[PDB]
Design a protein around this ligand. Structure first.
Ligand SMILES: [Zn+2]
Ligand SMILES: [Zn+2]
Lengths: 117, 209, 248, 271, 539
DNA sequence: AGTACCTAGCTTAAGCCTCAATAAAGCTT
DNA sequence: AAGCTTTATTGAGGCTTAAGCAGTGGGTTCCAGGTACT
């Protein structure tokens, strides 16, 4: 599955509330301040991932390669740019940090490619 | 479940029989320790609306001497027993000529009927017990030493020998699970024999307060 | 109780690289006090010492409040002249002090020989088999040897005391389910026997000269003389029996 | 302490551990979501078991993991039965067979509110009590080394023997309910809490239990204290029938004298 | 004072104007945020604002002078932000990450009933320290509270509404990050979260209230002598006792007030080492006889900042500390030149930005208050350092800290920060060349002093904040020679490891060969050793 | 002006607030 | 009138608040100020 985002109203720019359609049996997000209706996209209006299957590559930014305080390795080349040097670090996050998973970020400028071993 | 229910009922029956035997009642030897299979054959092996339902295993036991008094045990059908339900037991109780009786409740028993149980203590004594209390014979636990109820003559002998009054003895709660197991009333000294690692054996006494 | 925490962002000191779980980075000191500690190790050694002093400084206040509660709770518990333990309001706490009436100064750790033999080992070491001739010849003088062999009443008594030992052996195993016998008792019997041996110049190579019936009678008389609870009524007799049950 | 064959079997000990640890669906679920499928015969997920049905258009789609499913030794129908028992006929549960790793529970109401379905969704991940008892956290099991916990038996030749059988160690406290469980030794199973024993095993068992516990903390560091002093403190706390806590709340509640009680921390209030 | 030598012991405190996220595990709040906001050169002392997450998941705010837990959405509506989209823009900077939106949704849906700014402000005025009479005189009380009470460091003016809203949204965003754990929690013992009140700030705090009392007395005098129709006497209007006796009492007694005590202690003159130790002593404001150990433990950030060995071994272990040798407390300067420099470069202010480019750049903090955005964090830290390696605009005491994991960049100019000077390391080389030693050996001749070396861009002061983002080597002889490479990316080098000790621990021969408790005991007794404590003792 | 007279955490009982059985009261057929 | 329903009703679960928190010596500072009346 996937996460669900908060829908926004078009007139008063508030957040839309899901509701059911009594005649067409479809789900509709409805504003409460004004009366604005829209055709919903997916049946999943709520989701809850509890098993912390949190991919970390999205949270890792390419700017971290500029940090002098991180360890460097000439042992793992970049997959995209082929740069032989890349830095590595832990997950750096709560709801995590139970497994020692290394995350690699290529230090080559203007590439910023990141991956996990 | 059904096998779990009949196992629980057999355990409750075993503990009740052991309680009656330890209290000084006429307990038949095989009834004192019967096999789960024996209980299942004797009662029906289907408590879930079947032969071994409640009110069928109301155990009537008399005293070892002076067999007039009995506390034929009760097993209410409903989990939360109440005043209008214990009045049926009271009617059956007055139908006989005895005063003591025990009930084995399933869930928490109502405070109004709790007060009611005290409300006829001088007339006829009623004790209550929850199911989890009668799934284990606490007297068999290694932490619980041998509790023995003392007769009035023995209590007088003790007080005259030690030249002390009933007030000076160490006391025991009336709601003590051991006291409830023996069903001892207020003002009834209970000798306790426990092993001592510095003297071998040590006998203490606990008055009921 | 654990290694040096990451005080900084995922590093114990700014001198180590981030996410360094190595020995030196997390506080292990490989040097000795003779070689001296590196500055990173010296600071980490200060980490442990500061924890020790903090424990020492805080323990005093919390512990100090404790004994005051204990003493003020039991500042009137004493032993009355009937050997019983009563509080200020004459409520008996223990019928005898320490469940035996023995003070805590004149007791020693002793080993119960009756506990932890095998059944055959217990019988081999305690039964005093009188049927063997040569064993009696070596242990006792010949006048005593024929006295034991001829009379059967003495043989009956020696059998009866062993019966008490098996009864005692079962009692100890009930009292001590754990297989240990390091128990505190007032009189160090083994030492006094060894004290008696050196005083009287035994030379245990020679056969002894005491009648075993004197040993049985002497012990029984001695047990009567050791009185914790006076009186003659069976209630006091049971208390006296229970008070010196382990010692007897 | 385990009673019989379970004490010498790690697999049976695991079963007892699973029957004692408090297990909720949150510890078992992987992820959960709600959907709006007015046609159960054709769900938006387009899975297989949708034909089991052949009433509310919004459902609860919760997916279970296999690792926690196997460790707790549960079956899929047990969870549905617990939910049905805990919620009556207002809820319907359609589960998945052991066809794929994806363990799917589809839950619908008899018709209420989606927010209410979310409200009960937060009200299920907490307290169905799938396995074990309440007031208990993860339980740790191991083989003992010291003979105090090792089962000491007497062989037919009279010699002691230290049997090393599996013992359990919880992190909550609940007697009178664990002792009720099968394959559990109701005799040797002790506890750490003192108040709990007083409710269960009475006052005299506490005097023994407090003695053993106080001896444990004193002798842990190898120090020795005579048993006379242990006995007196345990007896003076139990010479009143109830637990006499050594504070102003327990010492100053017995008839000792106004001066004794004022000699303690609270002075003016007593006098 | 009255012939007695008094020493103002430095009292540390939580760093003001800094957002902190803590975990009150015992209360009903899963995660609580706070910021002891205090505008510089403001007579009114700090006012702590709490934003705490409910444990159950709504978000509430504990505003000053308000006794109820106001919801965050209520406050945002009260700031002239009615649309939910605008509030979410000010709180959540990305519109492609649904998880935080879903997590904050219950708080947004808590107060969808209130939609008008007037209604929100009326609810703000409800259940305050000074209750409102009616709708009137309660709208103005709420406006005053939001204008002059909470978040004073972001500005106190009519047009500061958007800046205050941006800062509150940042606080909520940081609380949400702490709740998700993407950012770790903040430590109460990290010395980057603390400031040291020296004699300057302490006397300023006393003088604020004392001068206020003098002004109040002058006002009373003027009220007395205008009601008679006459003209007051200004010489008799100002009484000198209320402005001098207050200082004399606060310094002679130590009672810092008319509050806490022991601020001014009698100088210890048994030994010159004791005198030096008493002048470099830090006193923890945490009370004594506490069973907790975290405020007393030797935190990792005490390296080189404070002596690790010297501390009173009594009931004040770890609380009372002695300053290290080369440790220097920043006396603070005005941030206006830094703001002018930032506006000179391509920095965009909060009042001229869209809420869409916020997530793709680094937020810039100056003395805690959020000033704007920069698109390129690199070449900005480089430029700021280059000016701090030249003393062009930025004073040496000012410290720049670039958070790299999270797109943040903070510049501190506060008065009370603790820093130490450190060598500056280029690619793999020190900037302390041989010519510097040659010019420094011939002092009193070339007039080449330490300040000349600082202006030379060779050494610089690094505080606790910047220590978290620096790779610092022991010595050049070991960590700049090619080996099995450890990091090969050193930024600073320690001048000498022995300078991490205090004044009393520096007299211990071979202190590393001893045991740390023995070093602490020696540092304690080093202040008690008799000797020639001063040269003019005969007078 | 000098001087005399008036004005940081803990724990645990403990009181306080709310909620579900239950018999009296009165309808109800 | 036996039973159902209502309505106090009454005992039984959850929140704030005092009140305690190891032992002996040595120094420093402060205890009226403000008006009123001769
Ligand atoms: Zn709208
Ligand atoms: Zn790359």
């Amino acid at each position: 599955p996937g996460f669900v985002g908060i829908r926004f109203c078009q007139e008063c720019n508030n957040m839309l509330y899901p509701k059911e359609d009594k005649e067409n049996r479809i789900l509709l997000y409805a504003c409460r301040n004004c009366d604005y209706q829209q055709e919903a996209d997916n049946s999943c209006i709520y989701v809850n991932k509890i098993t912390h299957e949190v991919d970390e590559l999205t949270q890792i930014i390419a700017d971290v390669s500029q940090d002098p305080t991180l360890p460097r390795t000439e042992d793992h080349p970049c997959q995209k740019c082929g740069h032989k040097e890349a830095v590595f670090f832990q997950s750096h996050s709560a709801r995590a940090e139970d497994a020692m998973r290394l995350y690699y970020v290529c230090t080559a400028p203007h590439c910023g490619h990141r991956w996990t071993e | 479940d059904d096998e779990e229910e009949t196992y629980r009922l057999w355990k409750i029956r075993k503990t009740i029989m052991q309680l009656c035997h330890d209290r000084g009642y006429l307990v038949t030897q095989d009834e004192l320790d019967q096999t789960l299979e024996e209980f299942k054959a004797q009662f029906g092996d289907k408590p879930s609306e079947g032969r071994p339902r409640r009110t069928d295993l109301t155990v009537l036991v008399a005293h070892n001497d002076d067999p007039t008094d009995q506390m034929f045990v009760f097993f209410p059908e409903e989990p939360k027993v109440g005043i209008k339900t214990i009045k049926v037991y009271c009617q059956r109780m007055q139908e006989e000529n005895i005063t003591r009786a025990l009930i084995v409740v399933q869930q928490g028993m109502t405070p109004s009927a709790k007060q009611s149980l005290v409300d006829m203590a001088p007339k006829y004594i009623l004790e209550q017990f929850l199911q989890q209390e009668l799934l284990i014979n606490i007297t068999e636990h290694e932490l619980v030493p041998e509790h023995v109820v003392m007769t009035k003559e023995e209590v007088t002998e003790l007080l005259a020998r030690y030249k002390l009054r009933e007030n000076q003895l160490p006391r025991i709660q009336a709601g003590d699970p051991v006291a409830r197991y023996f069903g001892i009333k207020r003002g009834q000294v209970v000798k306790i024999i426990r092993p001592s690692e510095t003297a071998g054996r040590y006998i203490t006494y606990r008055l009921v307060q | 109780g654990k290694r040096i925490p990451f005080g900084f962002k995922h590093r114990t000191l700014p001198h180590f690289i981030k996410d360094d779980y190595g020995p030196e980075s997390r506080g292990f000191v490989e040097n000795s006090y003779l070689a001296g500690l590196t500055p990173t190790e010296f600071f980490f050694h200060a980490m442990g010492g500061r924890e020790g002093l903090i424990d020492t400084a805080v323990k005093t206040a919390e512990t100090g409040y404790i004994q005051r509660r204990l003493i003020k709770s039991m500042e009137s518990v004493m032993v009355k002249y009937d050997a019983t333990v009563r509080n200020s309001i004459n409520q008996v706490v223990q019928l005898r002090y320490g469940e035996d009436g023995l003070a805590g100064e004149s007791v020693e750790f002793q080993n119960l020989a009756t506990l932890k033999p095998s059944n055959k080992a217990f019988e081999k070491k305690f039964r005093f088999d009188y049927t063997n001739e040569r064993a009696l010849r070596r242990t006792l003088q010949e006048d005593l040897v024929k006295d034991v062999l001829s009379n059967a009443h003495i043989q009956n008594e020696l059998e009866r005391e062993f019966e008490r030992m098996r009864e005692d052996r079962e009692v100890l195993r009930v009292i001590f389910p754990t297989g240990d016998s390091k128990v505190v008792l007032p009189c160090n019997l083994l030492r006094m026997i060894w004290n008696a041996q050196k005083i009287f110049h035994i030379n245990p190579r020679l056969p002894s000269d005491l009648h075993p019936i004197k040993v049985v009678e002497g012990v029984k008389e001695l047990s009567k003389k050791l009185v914790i609870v006076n009186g003659d009524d069976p209630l006091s007799r049971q208390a006296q029996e229970n008070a010196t049950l382990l010692f007897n | 302490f385990l009673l019989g064959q379970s004490a010498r079997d790690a697999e049976r000990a695991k079963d007892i551990l699973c029957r004692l640890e408090h297990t909720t669906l949150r510890k078992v679920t992987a992820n959960t979501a709600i959907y709006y499928d007015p046609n159960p015969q054709s769900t938006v997920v387009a899975e297989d078991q949708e034909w089991v049905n052949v009433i509310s258009p919004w459902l609860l789609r919760v997916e279970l993991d296999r690792k926690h499913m196997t460790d707790r030794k549960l079956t899929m129908e047990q969870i549905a039965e617990k939910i049905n028992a805990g919620f009556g006929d207002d809820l319907n549960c359609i589960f998945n067979d052991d066809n794929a790793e994806k363990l799917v529970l589809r839950i619908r109401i008899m018709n209420d509110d989606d927010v209410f379905l979310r409200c009960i969704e937060s009200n299920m991940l907490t307290d169905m009590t799938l396995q074990g008892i309440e007031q208990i956290s993860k339980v740790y099991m191991h083989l003992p080394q010291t003979d105090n916990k090792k089962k000491i038996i007497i062989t037919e030749d009279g010699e002691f023997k230290a049997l090393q059988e599996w013992i359990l160690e919880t992190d909550g406290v609940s007697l009178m309910r664990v002792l009720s469980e099968k394959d559990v030794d109701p005799v040797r199973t002790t506890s750490n809490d003192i108040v709990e024993i007083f409710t269960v095993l009475g006052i005299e068992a506490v005097r023994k239990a407090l003695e053993r516990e106080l001896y444990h903390v004193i002798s842990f560091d190898g120090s020795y204290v005579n048993y006379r002093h242990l006995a007196l403190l345990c007896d003076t706390m139990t010479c009143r029938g109830h637990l006499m806590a050594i504070t102003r709340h327990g010492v100053n509640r017995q008839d000792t004298g106004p001066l004794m009680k004022c000699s303690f921390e609270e002075t003016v209030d007593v006098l | 004072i009255n012939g007695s030598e008094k020493v103002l012991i430095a009292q540390e405190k939580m760093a003001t104007n800094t957002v902190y996220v803590f975990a009150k595990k015992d209360s009903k709040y899963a995660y609580t945020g706070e910021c002891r906001s205090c505008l510089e050169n403001s007579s009114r002392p700090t006012s702590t604002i709490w934003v705490s997450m409910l444990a159950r998941q709504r978000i509430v705010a504990t505003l000053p002078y308000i006794k109820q837990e106001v919801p965050i959405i209520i406050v945002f509506r009260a700031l002239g932000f009615v649309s939910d989209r605008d509030i979410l823009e000010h709180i959540i900077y990305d519109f492609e990450d649904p998880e935080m939106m879903e997590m904050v949704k219950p708080s947004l849906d808590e107060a969808f009933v209130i939609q008008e700014q007037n209604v929100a402000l009326n609810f703000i005025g409800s259940r305050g320290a000074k209750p409102g009479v009616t709708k009137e005189k309660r709208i103005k009380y709420a406006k005053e509270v939001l204008q002059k009470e909470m978040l004073p460091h972001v500005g106190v003016s009519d047009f500061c509404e958007t800046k205050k809203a941006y800062f509150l949204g940042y606080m909520v965003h940081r609380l949400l990050l702490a709740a998700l754990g993407r950012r770790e929690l903040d430590d109460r013992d990290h010395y980057g979260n603390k400031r040291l009140d020296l004699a300057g700030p302490l006397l300023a705090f006393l003088f604020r209230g004392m001068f206020k009392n003098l002004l109040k007395e002058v006002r009373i005098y003027a009220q007395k002598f205008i009601d008679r129709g006459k003209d007051f006497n200004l010489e008799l209007a100002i009484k000198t006792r209320i402005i001098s006796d207050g200082l004399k009492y606060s310094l002679a007694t130590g009672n810092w007030g008319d509050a806490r005590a022991g601020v001014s202690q009698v100088l210890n003159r048994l030994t010159f080492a004791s005198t030096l130790s008493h002048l470099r002593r830090l006193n923890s404001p945490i009370g004594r006889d506490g069973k907790l150990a975290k405020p007393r433990q030797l935190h990792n950030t005490l390296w080189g900042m404070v002596c690790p060995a010297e501390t009173p071994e009594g009931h004040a272990v770890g609380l009372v500390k002695n300053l290290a040798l080369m440790a220097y407390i920043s006396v603070g300067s005005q941030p206006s030149p830094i703001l002018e420099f930032l506006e000179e470069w391509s920095m965009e202010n909060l009042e001229e930005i869209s809420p869409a480019a916020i997530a793709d750049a680094t937020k810039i903090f100056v003395n805690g208050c959020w000033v704007g955005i920069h698109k390129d964090p690199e070449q900005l830290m480089n430029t700021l350092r280059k000016l701090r390696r030249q003393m062009d605009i930025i004073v040496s005491e000012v410290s720049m800290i670039r958070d790299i994991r999270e797109r943040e960049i903070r510049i501190y100019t506060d008065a009370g920060r603790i820093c130490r000077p450190l060598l500056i390391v280029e690619k793999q080389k020190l900037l302390l060349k041989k010519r510097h030693i040659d010019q420094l050996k011939e002092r009193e001749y070339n007039n080449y002093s330490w300040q000349d070396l600082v202006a030379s861009g060779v050494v610089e002061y690094i505080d606790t904040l910047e220590e978290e983002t620096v790779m610092l080597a022991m010595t050049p002889d070991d960590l700049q020679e090619k080996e099995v490479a450890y990091c090969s990316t050193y930024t600073h080098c320690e001048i000498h490891p022995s300078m991490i000790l205090g004044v009393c621990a520096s007299i211990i021969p071979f202190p590393d060969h001893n045991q740390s408790p023995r070093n602490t005991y020696q540092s304690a007794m080093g202040k008690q050793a008799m000797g020639v404590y001063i040269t003019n003792f005969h007078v």
